[PDB]
Amino acid sequence: DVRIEKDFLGEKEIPKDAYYGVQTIRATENFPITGYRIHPELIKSLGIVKKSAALANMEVGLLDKEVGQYIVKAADEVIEGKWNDQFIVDPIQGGAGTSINMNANEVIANRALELMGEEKGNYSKISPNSHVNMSQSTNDAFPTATHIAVLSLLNQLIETTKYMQQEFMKKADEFAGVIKMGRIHLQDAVPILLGQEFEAYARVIARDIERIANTRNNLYDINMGATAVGTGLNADPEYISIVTEHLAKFSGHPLRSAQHLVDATQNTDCYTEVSSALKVCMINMSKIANDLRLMASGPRAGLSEIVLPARQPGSSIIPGMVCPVMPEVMNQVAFQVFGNDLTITSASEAGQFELNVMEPVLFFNLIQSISIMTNVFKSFTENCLKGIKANEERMKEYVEKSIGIITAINPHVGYETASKLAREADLTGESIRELCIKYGVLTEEQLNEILNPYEMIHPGIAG
Amino acid sequence: DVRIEKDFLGEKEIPKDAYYGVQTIRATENFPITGYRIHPELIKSLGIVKKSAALANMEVGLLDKEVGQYIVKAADEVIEGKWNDQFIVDPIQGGAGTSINMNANEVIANRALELMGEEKGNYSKISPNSHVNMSQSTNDAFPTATHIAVLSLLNQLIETTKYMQQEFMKKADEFAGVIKMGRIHLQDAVPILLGQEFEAYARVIARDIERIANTRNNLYDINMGATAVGTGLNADPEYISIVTEHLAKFSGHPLRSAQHLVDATQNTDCYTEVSSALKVCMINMSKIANDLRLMASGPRAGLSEIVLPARQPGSSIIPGMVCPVMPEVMNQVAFQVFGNDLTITSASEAGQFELNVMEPVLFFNLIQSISIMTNVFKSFTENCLKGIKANEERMKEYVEKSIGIITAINPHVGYETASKLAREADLTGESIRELCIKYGVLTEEQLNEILNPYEMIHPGIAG
Amino acid sequence: DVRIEKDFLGEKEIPKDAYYGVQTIRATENFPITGYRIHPELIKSLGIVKKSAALANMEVGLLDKEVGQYIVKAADEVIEGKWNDQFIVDPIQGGAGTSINMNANEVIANRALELMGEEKGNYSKISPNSHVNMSQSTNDAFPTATHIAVLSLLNQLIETTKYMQQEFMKKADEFAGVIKMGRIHLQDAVPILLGQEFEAYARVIARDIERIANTRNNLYDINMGATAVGTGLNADPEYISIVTEHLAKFSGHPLRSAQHLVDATQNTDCYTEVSSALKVCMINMSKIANDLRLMASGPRAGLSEIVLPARQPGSSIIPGMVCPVMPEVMNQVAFQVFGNDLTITSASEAGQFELNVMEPVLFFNLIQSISIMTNVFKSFTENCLKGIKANEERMKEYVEKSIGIITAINPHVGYETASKLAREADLTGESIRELCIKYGVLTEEQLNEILNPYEMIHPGI
Amino acid sequence: DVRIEKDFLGEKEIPKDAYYGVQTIRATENFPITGYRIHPELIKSLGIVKKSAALANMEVGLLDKEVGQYIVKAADEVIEGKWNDQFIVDPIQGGAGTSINMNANEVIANRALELMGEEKGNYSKISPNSHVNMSQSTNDAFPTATHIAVLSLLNQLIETTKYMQQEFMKKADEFAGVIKMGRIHLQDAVPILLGQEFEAYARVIARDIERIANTRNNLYDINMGATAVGTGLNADPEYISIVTEHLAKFSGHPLRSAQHLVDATQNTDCYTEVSSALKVCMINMSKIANDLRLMASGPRAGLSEIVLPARQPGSSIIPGMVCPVMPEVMNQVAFQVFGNDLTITSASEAGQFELNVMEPVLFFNLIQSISIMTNVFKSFTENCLKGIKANEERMKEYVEKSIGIITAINPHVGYETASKLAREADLTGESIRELCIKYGVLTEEQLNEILNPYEMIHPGI
Ligand code: NA
Ligand code: NA
């Protein structure tokens, strides 16, 4: 039922059908923290790293082509997502990612052994350390795999967010004629188009796409060849060049060998720069969600400017309640990303000399942020945003009854007079138009032009 | 293979062997955010809530005793942890916890139906809403279950942390004779006992236990009977009294019916008060961990004051490296709790009028904090703290070679003279004792008493 | 125009009329960061510390009675707030607070010298280090002073908060009969009294008062006598017991000498505990302020449930605009405190071995939090909360025309009739009450009982 | 001693000699929160805004040429920093910045009145609202001024940072030959040059310069002309084009009128983008400062790899102590910025519909971050970084007696001999180099090449 493996600390039993090994099992004893598994994209990227390294090591004559070809086939299986269940270590873990790198090394070595008809655990023939980890350290393989995983996930977030942004733009278009009252401080102000607010939403999101896209650039620099500390001592420059080109080609990213491997091994600014752009994006999305929730308030004692698609019963006790559950989950995902960014800040700040050992919790958080933003943006776009409808009559009635349309008469008649009219209209509950007429401030004809609400929506002195 | 269920929004297919229902499946479409499951303690507590309610509702004559007895048996199964797999909704979810409450209501209703020989889905006989949720709202059942789960988890953290605190105290005792140099600003200062530092660690942790224990008090107030908004309109006061006593008795906590149900339904300060005490605790533990990592630095170009149990190979490329992986994972768990507390802050701040809809992400975070602190504290206590050893010779050599022992001569001979001696000793690399003798500041006899390092470890003018 | 002073590092020019000295001037070159000054209460508390130490050192025969007496009189002037302008060092400073301790030691020494007719700078007669700092370290004097300052500031915050909490409870009373629509998810639910919301506000604030008051307890333990690292090297144990008693008696706080001075010198959890309770309080206050600003929304396209006292013009372009400026500044002070608390967290976490050197920024933020909360609570209470008025008729009208008011009538009339009444109410203009009367379902007298605000908003039928 | 002024809300007494007015005095009663004043660069930028608007309004025939000319001269005095003392409102204030805009409008109006020989307060002749605020809102004037202030402050930070970055690169050069032990997890690893660490420092700082410089781009889009909500109601489109050009030309920044003024009036992402780049920079700087403080640990029980310039006595009780005060204040400024960034995050998130009213606290924090970073970078560069010295012999000695130096010799000597050499080195006192010589394994000349600092620290064999 079990086999026995060993490292410099001793021996352990492994289930015979497991592809992980001794260093993996030790990580499960050392760090039973969350019970989560690493993201499958990171597993995939680990497999891209070990395939790339095995090819490069063979090409430069360091690795036996017999063993190397099986390492490559096993790594391809990992890349295709065939072995996600064998990656059992905790995302939150001591040892700076060694246990993640070793989980990859062990799984690939053991699967390679099985593919050449050998016994799993026979590290004499295929060693996790000496073959699958050849020319590598934790301190290059783990971050390089993370750069690749983060880049692949960012590319998916970007595509999802461009889709959402475009759906905001379609709503802006659908609502381009819908007039309502703009509010500042939650006080009635002057008229605005609902489509102008939705375009404001589309535009901030366009700016977020650009910020997030631009954070990829610093992740294209990888540190493969760094060895233990970034000096690259005893790394072969031809190994570095060739592994880099394989990593680029198999991952699909324009990866580059960092110009200064010590810089690239010990600094973590590439990661906080990403987390920062994700946070900024979710600030904007939370604000947008808060607006949607206010606009959907009601149905009788709220603003009731829009109707969201109903997505689930709101209450078992208020008959027929529907709640804005999709904006609410967007807010919650924002609050989660805000927190993840503080965990990332604190972990990046904790780096010491040649290595930041806090990267596992940094990378867990950063991947989680990207992943939950992708998922909530997809679900919000499909289950809410596309289906939003406007209560046009209600919003028109707000404009029809406002005081603040009176703003438009300031350049003609003065803020002082308009204020007197505004105060009176507010205290009597009369229409501001009627008051202008009854006091001879303006004629019916000239305030038909001046108090045109649609015309006040683009710049100019009315008239 | 499937059955069909319905709510006021429409019909859905459910796998025939599933105990969840239509509202559950809708939550899985609305919120595919994390893919996590709610903590099993919360599942258990939901079952305590629905059992308690069913008993109270029968006792006051609202619920049929035939259906009620099966609801109770099903809820007991949930309480014992037999149905954790049927709780499939995302911890991060819109609808303020409705989908969590409905997952409980559905699972219990359906299991109850199966126990009385009926068809799952036959809500005519046993309704998730009308029977299992009777006299309840999301807005009391969900927070009440959370109070119970948080209290049970806090009690386990407290016990784990008292164990850790006691193991720190044992190390303080083991090291009570071990002399070393105290450092301020990382500059050599005056002698201290290693056992005094470990007692400083034990004492802050004692203070953390007290803070965390004291946060339970505000969670003992529950809001069962609140109905939709806290008014309790149409709740039966005898139902409230009786359900409270069952909740207390089955959960083991001294629960109390809040004095003002509107306050208790809309305020979330009980939760941030807990998160705050957890954060403070992890600030202290991170600092302690950082100290341990500095003391274990080396082995030749570091401080090398202590040796930690080796827990995994440190490197595949530095021969025989061992890294302080257990302190490192403690730091990472701190950074995670710091972030979780910011998510909790932001979610509590977002409450509006009669309900804080952001509670799902608040409660996910708070439970995660308590849970990961418990797990890392257990693992750190067993896999590191108990086994720590002191390099007594090294630390003694620091004291033997220090400048700063010279502090003790200030009251005798003046800070001005001691400074001259200190500077000289620092620039020549001579022993400060020899300099005192050679310049006739003190006799060999009087500085044998005065520069006794052990005596400078407790208050007094040396002499 | 200058004198020359000297420390371990060499000599510096000091303005002839200055009471600070060489170690102070160096700090002003090293840390020109914010341009702020330390809080006057911290200056005061430093004066309490140096007075207390001078008395204890004299009593134990370590300090000259005559020189000690002048140190004490100079310290008393500092305590009374006469020399705040001589405390020039930046609150954000390296050195772990040495520069603040030295600013006190120098000002006091020099003023003491002036009081005995000597020249400022004559450290031969009265030394900042040897006399004013005798038996002490930065690492006990500076924290002890901070514990005392923070305690004093907390006591004032608590009194201000208790005043605000009581004014919320008066508004709860004023509004005890005012009915409105409760909202969950911002969706119309069932009726609630405005007074119940204000009471929920007052109750959370009561809980905050308790949390904050309870953070004082760990600050009453001081480390005076710890000297450099908590070992108490060069502090006589009788000096420690005497200085502690003077610190308690002059400060008015029940200070205690910590049970383990090494613990109390290196751990900073008393400070994060305080910051935490301040953050939690401001979370609740921010939420309350958010609710107020929603209730004040309008005048015609908003909820318009309450009217806040007008405090300033809202706009120089929109005629008639007035804005909820006092809830808004409450929000902003919350966001400030949240941030201050993260700075405090990060500084506390950065402690190393025997000393946390990041205390200056930690204490600057903590004292800032306490201070801005006191000031905004006072201003918000006097300029907004006391004057809040309810639009009772508006709120009643929406309750009368809601769906949710059906909930009060359901057990009386049964679900079948309730549904028919609800349907009619949707399609006609009419309130459920009027319809109950029109169709003889309930009598006007029975509806007066059933839809009584208190009765629709409490448990029972 | 007083005059009387009046707004929409009524009349107030103003000190006769004050240039501020009624809306300003009300703000000083409403918000006595911090006691701070807005940054002088924001005052300056407000003056640029009001000058620019007065010129555009005149050009378009909306404002009297004569009154406009006095408004402009008064604005120019504000721009030159002559009236900073008249800006008394608190940076933390409700009203979304109205009180800051009004403080500018009032000071300028009153000074303009004094320049034409009129009485301060005579708003009949020159109105804060009607003339100085003409064609504007708080909601365009205040942000536009902030964009300009922040841009100016960023440009100074960038220049200061570039100076610091270059001084790190000079130290990398000075230390290019200095070998020491690289450490991972604080465990001894393999040799590294001190110069490579300093170059890693310089390179991250280069990346920070780039991030921060790139945040300017979104600030060049301004919303002047948006008026209340971005619709531009009451702003003539030719006024918008002319005021934008004046704003660019007087400020020296390439300002552009935002493409959608409603977007630019309600969204605050340009500000969080800036705060984010500042936070990221200070994360890196804090880490660097942590490393410096570890390298400076000692003198006898620490690493003692570097010596920092001494800047102040470390202790008045421990003789001889000097502390790394300049890295320490760098840490503390980082923690400050981290917190400021959370305040900024929370304020930005709190935007509602057409306006984010939490901008005053957001801008106070953002400007504070930029300002304290500039000041600490300058002071740290001049008072520490330039003067850092290496303990080269100490560092070399530990490299020579390490295990890790074996790594350079392994491919030359093969694993079997390397292990024998390592074992011997552990048990005897002797360095691997000496042992290589003693046992004829390698020649002294071959060891000079192999263990050359540059050669053991770069890829290859
Ligand atoms: Na988190
Ligand atoms: Na701050």
Author numbering:
A (entry chain B), B (entry chain B): 4 to 466
C (entry chain A), D (entry chain A): 4 to 464
Article passage:
Aspartate ammonia lyases catalyze the reversible amination of fumarate to l-aspartate. Furthermore, a conserved flexible loop, named SS-loop, that contains a two serine signature sequence plays an important role in substrate binding and catalysis. One of the serines acts as a general base in the deamination reaction by abstracting a proton from the Cβ atom of the substrate, forming an enolate anion intermediate.
b The variant of AspB carrying the AspB-A1 pocket (T187I+M321I+K324M+N326C) and the loop mutations A422S+Y429D were used further and relabeled AspB-6x. To rationalize the effect of mutations that allowed for β-alanine synthesis, crystal structures of variants AspB-6x and CcAsp-6x were determined to 1.9 and 3.1 Å resolution, respectively. Additional hydrophobic contacts are formed between Cys326 and Val328. Thus, the mutations that remove the charged binding pocket for the α-carboxylate group of aspartate may also have a stabilizing effect on the closed SS-loop conformation. In the crystal structure of wild-type AspB, the open conformation of the SS-loop at unliganded active sites is stabilized via hydrophobic interactions with C-terminal domain residues Ile406, Tyr418, Ala421, Ala422, Ala425, and Tyr429.17 Mutations A422S and Y429D disrupt this hydrophobic cluster and thus will destabilize the open-loop conformation and shift the equilibrium toward the closed-loop conformation.
